[PDB]
Design a protein around this nucleic acid. Structure first.
Ligand SMILES: [Mg+2]
Ligand SMILES: [Mg+2]
Lengths: 296, 446, 446, 296
DNA sequence: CTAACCGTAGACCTA
DNA sequence: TGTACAGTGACAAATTATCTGTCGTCGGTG
DNA sequence: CACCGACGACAGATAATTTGTCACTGTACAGGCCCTAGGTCTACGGTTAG
DNA sequence: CTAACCGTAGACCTA
DNA sequence: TGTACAGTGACAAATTATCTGTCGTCGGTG
DNA sequence: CACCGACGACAGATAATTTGTCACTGTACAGGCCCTAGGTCTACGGTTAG
């Protein structure tokens, strides 16, 4: 009956082929979206390679809830102005209701895709129905469509206002941003890491250095991060029945450009592939057998 | 820089409470709300008053308020403050210096004091074990922190002076040390000789092995010079070594970064360094150069532990069969070591990064093609005595011998420099100062 | 000698099945039974057939049939028989003798063979780790079995000869051994002397300490004799030792049960044994006499580890501060050891049984009141040389000295026995054979 | 409607004071009985110090089920002739139904004591309402009453036959004994023991030696025993989800007379105090403090 | 020229 | 940011003994 | 002869088990046990007596 | 008586 | 059946911070 | 004024935490690291020249 009264989530396999940084072929990605049913406006998205099973939506919701703040690189003209909790959130069928509950809204269990197909995806390189497209590029394209076209379009059910304008028009009150740390029930976790002397951690073959983490050299901690950007990781101390936030740590030795999780894995497996090629065609096997024969 | 405790996953009782709460947070007709409270109490089977605290509780603590609150006396001790401090103090003194104290012994000391003070209720031994627990425990992590090392492609090492030295290219900085080989040897007759010393020269930039020697001569400036000689000149081996690859390394370092033991701070090495043109530096601590030391463990693990006569790595693990089983000679072991180094070790992938073999890291990283140093220009590794005086008639004094040869008589009374081979002093090379230059005069015979 | 597998506690699914079964085991009208089957299938939500197997299954296996049957391929390997045996064989050879083989090296050998045989699919390293697992594992228990020891009140020990010797009463069998004390000492000036030897004599029946000595003299027949002397004569100490109890033990053993090292199979000890009237026996193995050795650990744990200059059991644990901190003298340490033994150790409760202190076990167990052996009858511990010949004039040949005294001249040409103190040979006691009896003649002077 | 059609169990605290082997006073015992409701005949008993909670009845049932075979020491004149499963077994409120189930009879949940009071207990030494009585003696007295008096008495509800005779009279068939091992779902257990070299185990400060146990030196096993007689213990191997009988082991170094569990604990607790007695007076404490002072 | 005899020293074993 | 190889959790893929249906057949019962 | 329970021949689906892959972490490299102090047992150049 | 000078040896430090 | 003390699971008893009622009081609402 | 929700003063019951007790088991006792091979640096009885 009003804007943010009811939110609805949706998911699909996206039939666009992605190709990696080294020209290697990757499998097809998943897309999950969150939409406000009052004006049909897109609140937030999640594009990646993981199935919308248990996870993904947790991060998509977080994306919807938190302010957007996109960079110059996405070449956006319009501001993606939403943030804030709904009264109800519908998802496609416990932890999902725990999120609702810790945040303040009711979770329920149980179609933008029609327009992405026609207006974006079927027109992109690698469309499965030769050409290359990385995940980062695809996500830039996707948000450009959503912030500057879809949400700016006037629907046939309204005619007067755009999907975002009606969203604005229907707000019964000024929403107030929630401090981000309040959202740390969504971020993905690694269960155990040890603090290295000086206050450092390893994650995905990168080294991280923490602020005041040094006093714990030798203890076990666990950590959370946003797969879209792993340059800063949240470190938690493990208390009985609680993860109590300890500090933040920054990646070191990497490139200036912000690094995503899929990109880190890719670099690491390329290095492994390379190692598996030198080998010991005869150099090592011969030596071992000869060593044994000479000993005998 | 605070807050954010986020609750752990809730158990079943809390899950039920959660649902109850979801129903009671929402306001509606006051009377209907009242009905919900009654319903809430029946679903929980507690009281009509309880669920007011449960919601209120949720209102401030969210999911955390649904966890079990701990007793909040946890970690506290029920004994007197005097005793808790007494135990902690006693233990800290008990292990000061070279001695050791057991928690058991501490508990006894406590008892003794309790008697003096007429205290009928000191803590029990079991309690002492619990009070000292956190102290015994921290130590276990403290002695076991794993350093991160370096992330790759960039490195430097410190000197005793506190100077940072960069390692920028192949043959920039070389390192050298000494160990024992954990294998007993026999001679050609089956008679046992004590295990040999192994000396290595390692290229810091690439971690490729530059040259080795092993045998029974204790560490000395002489041993070091012999080791360098091998590391510097071009290498070659015969067909008996059954090699597939050539060991291709040679050159000259700029820095000689090594330990502070006397074998390396000698006038002999200094002379070598001056004549060849490189500079020596000393480690600050054993943990400072790890790249020089490290490879010794991989030799034990990949090579020596597979040979007969292997003598473990300590005295705790020394196999009892170690003294009787040895059958290898020095000649045979050296051949094995060379084939191992050449076709396996220097063929492995650099551990820090990429797809470069050790040998390749070294070659890609060497700024220029080296020019071989003529073998005859290694005479500089011979020792120089700073002075003897030439006696009338042309004979000179040396190590309890007189030497004589062409020219010398006409130079009697002059002070001269003597270059000689510590292994064979049949002849001596005699130099004199000419404008502060050391200039060769003659070769004298015993 | 078989059967009886009794099932473990059943989980929830099985619990439901159990109830279903309880209803279906009982026969009734066939049609009604049929109804129960339908009901059974709905309670389980499976099929109308299934529950026939489930009951039948119960009929033979009871509660066990309700457990999950394992896949029965467990423990099997899917690789070829050739390779599984190849891996096992390789490893067994790899550790034969003094050498050591790692599972990783084995996996490589496998790979090498796979190449020779052109086998495109040998097992992976991870697989080798799993195949050898049970072999690495059994060993861990095999090296760590804890013997039961004896149950108390009855005991015997074996000799090298395989003879069983009973231990029936106090001073029946005594044992003796040597160790080092893990404490460095200094002299009255602060200068460090190497740690001392400790020699103990222990009463086997009671486990009470009979006598000790410690100092810097290496083990010898002489040391043993000195140790026995202390263990045999009545003890007494001065007020400076600050003792509460007297150390009350003395007597003479019947058997001397000890090690086979030369210090104990000497002619000197044999002479002692013959003169005092007791017999020596040797251990079969270090594990055979544990009562003699054992107490050395309790001294480290209760006394020595609390003293400055403490080293360690092994060089692996030797405190780095161990060489600098020592300040105790031999005199001081001995005083400490005596007070420790007297008012604490021999005061503890026997470990095997009851409420007897070590000292009391010994006293209650001694058949008779001992008669002190006069101190002057310990001259028998002096060494006897089996022969020297008396020279004309009455002088006799000894250790590069001649000795002379009353009588000897009239006995020249006779062969005589010489008893002397290895510590001071100023005079010698001369014996001659009279009817195969050793009879004293004279005391000769250098 | 017939003998062994329905069994009923009952329990009470027995208000007789027992005194131990060293004249020490013990607390009051529990008694549990099993009775056949057709003729009111006592099938088996369990006398001990543990509450009839979870345990005890399991052993009382086993006692009822298995043949009795009492020794000369109980001075019995009559044979206690029962053995065998009932159709139904009632006890006073899972594991109880698992026993039923593995054995073959139905377990149900929900008064001989009146006669024990009048005809035995109120007349014994230590009756709480000065004198000494051990547990073993009391149990001998109890079974003497049950085998030679209670079950041999003609009840007022019958007049023709004794409680046992009617039991006999009502059997529809000849019962057949069950091999004892089939009853190893009742016996008390210790969860872990290690086999000592040569094949030996410790339990209650006694040593036991097994038959063919030696091949397992170093492995973990678990064990079961009858508290009334711990001279032979049943050893089981631990398989996934099953205790698989391995062997039997006999006590060594003990007295010929069969030893019960309560008696073993008593001897052991008699030594501990004996150890706590002497201690150290000034002795130890003085030495320790002097050691420290001399060191300083 | 030839035979007998105590003190050093060497081979070997063990804790 | 001391150092690099042997050993180890966490998870995906291939193979297979075993459980589940559907139906047919034999035996007991009405 | 018709209906229901028990058993089997057969095919198909399914979790259990094994094997292979990948990232994160513990621990030795840092001069170091073959040497030493007894005893038995015996050989022996030199010395001395016949 | 007096002064100058290479080879042994001792004190000390470190791997 | 090698040996005997330091360290460790499994459980009972004492102390206490915290949860639960029952009732009283204040505030909002009908 | 009457009814219901929120808050508190108060007492009483209750599991959580700590402390003390008892039986079963791992592991060192078993000759053993202060010694050794270099180098620098310097003192020096003896020897030789004036
Ligand atoms: Mg010995
Ligand atoms: Mg060094």
């Amino acid at each position: 009956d009003y804007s943010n009264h009811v939110w609805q989530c949706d998911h699909t396999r996206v039939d666009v082929l992605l190709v990696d940084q080294h020209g290697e072929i990757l499998s097809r990605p998943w897309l999950t979206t969150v939409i406000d049913t009052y004006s049909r406006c897109i609140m937030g998205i999640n594009l990646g390679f993981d199935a919308p099973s248990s996870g993904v939506v947790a991060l998509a919701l977080r994306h919807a809830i938190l302010p957007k703040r996109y960079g110059s690189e996405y070449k956006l003209h319009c501001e993606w102005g939403t943030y804030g909790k709904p009264e109800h959130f519908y998802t496609d069928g416990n932890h999902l209701s725990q999120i609702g509950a810790q945040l303040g809204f009711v979770c329920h269990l149980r179609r933008p895709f029609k327009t992405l197909n026609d207006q974006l995806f079927s027109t992109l390189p690698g469309y499965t129905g030769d050409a290359r497209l990385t995940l980062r590029e695809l996500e830039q394209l996707l948000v450009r469509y959503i912030v500057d076209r879809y949400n700016q379009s006037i629907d046939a059910r309204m005619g007067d206002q755009t999907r975002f304008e009606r969203w604005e028009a229907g707000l019964p009150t000024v929403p107030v941003p929630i401090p981000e740390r309040d959202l740390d029930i969504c971020l993905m976790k690694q269960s155990r890491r040890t603090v290295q002397r000086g206050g450092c951690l390893q994650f995905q073959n990168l080294m991280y250095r923490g602020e005041y983490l040094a006093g714990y050299a030798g203890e076990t901690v666990n950590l959370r991060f946003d797969p879209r950007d792993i340059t800063t990781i949240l470190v938690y101390r493990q208390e009985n029945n609680q993860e109590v936030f300890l500090t933040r740590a920054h990646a070191q030795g990497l490139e200036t450009e912000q690094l995503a999780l899929d990109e880190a894995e890719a670099a690491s497996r390329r290095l492994r592939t390379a190692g598996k090629t030198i080998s010991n065609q005869s150099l090592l096997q011969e030596v071992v057998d000869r060593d044994a024969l000479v000993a005998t | 820089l605070e807050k954010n405790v986020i609750a752990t996953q809730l158990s079943e009782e809390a899950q039920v409470k959660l649902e109850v709460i979801q129903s009671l947070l929402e306001p509606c007709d006051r009377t209907t709300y009242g009905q919900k409270l009654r319903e809430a109490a029946e679903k929980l089977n507690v009281s009509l008053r309880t669920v007011q605290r449960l919601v209120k509780n949720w209102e401030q603590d969210g999911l955390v308020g649904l966890t079990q609150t701990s007793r909040a006396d946890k970690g506290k001790h029920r004994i007197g403050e005097f005793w808790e401090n007494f135990i902690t103090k006693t233990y800290k003194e008990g292990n000061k210096g070279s001695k050791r104290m057991t928690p058991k012994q501490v508990a006894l000391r406590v008892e003794a004091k309790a008697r003096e003070l007429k205290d009928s209720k000191p803590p029990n031994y079991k309690t002492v074990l619990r009070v000292l627990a956190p102290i015994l425990e921290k130590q276990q992590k403290a002695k076991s922190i794993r350093s991160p090392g370096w992330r790759g492609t960039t490195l430097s090492v410190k000197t005793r002076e506190g100077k940072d030295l960069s390692v920028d290219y192949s043959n920039h900085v070389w390192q050298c040390d000494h160990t024992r080989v954990d294998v007993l040897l026999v001679d050609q007759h089956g008679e046992i000789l004590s295990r040999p010393w192994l000396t290595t020269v390692i290229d810091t930039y690439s971690r490729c092995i530059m040259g080795i020697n092993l045998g029974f001569d204790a560490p000395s400036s002489g041993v070091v010079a012999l080791a360098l000689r091998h590391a510097i000149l071009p290498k070659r081996y015969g067909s008996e070594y059954k090699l597939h690859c050539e060991w291709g390394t040679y050159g000259k370092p700029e820095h000689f970064y090594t330990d502070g033991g006397k074998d390396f701070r000698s006038n002999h090495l200094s002379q070598i360094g001056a004549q060849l043109g490189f500079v020596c530096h000393l480690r600050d601590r054993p943990s400072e150069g790890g790249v020089v030391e490290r490879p010794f463990k991989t030799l034990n693990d990949q090579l020596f532990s597979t040979l007969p006569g292997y003598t473990g790595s300590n005295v705790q693990e020394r196999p009892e069969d170690a003294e009787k089983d040895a059958r290898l000679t020095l000649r045979e072991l050296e051949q094995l070591l060379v084939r191992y180094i050449v076709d396996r070790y220097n063929q492995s992938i650099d551990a820090r990064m990429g797809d470069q073999t050790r040998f390749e890291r070294w070659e890609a990283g060497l700024p220029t093609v080296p020019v071989p140093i003529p073998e005859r220009d290694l005479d500089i590794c011979l020792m120089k005595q700073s002075r003897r005086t030439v006696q009338r008639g042309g004979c000179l004094q040396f190590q309890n011998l007189m030497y004589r040869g062409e020219y010398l008589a006409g130079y009697a009374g002059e002070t001269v420099n003597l270059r000689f081979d510590p292994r064979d002093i049949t002849t001596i090379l005699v130099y004199r100062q000419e404008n502060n230059q050391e200039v060769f005069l003659t070769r004298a015979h015993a």
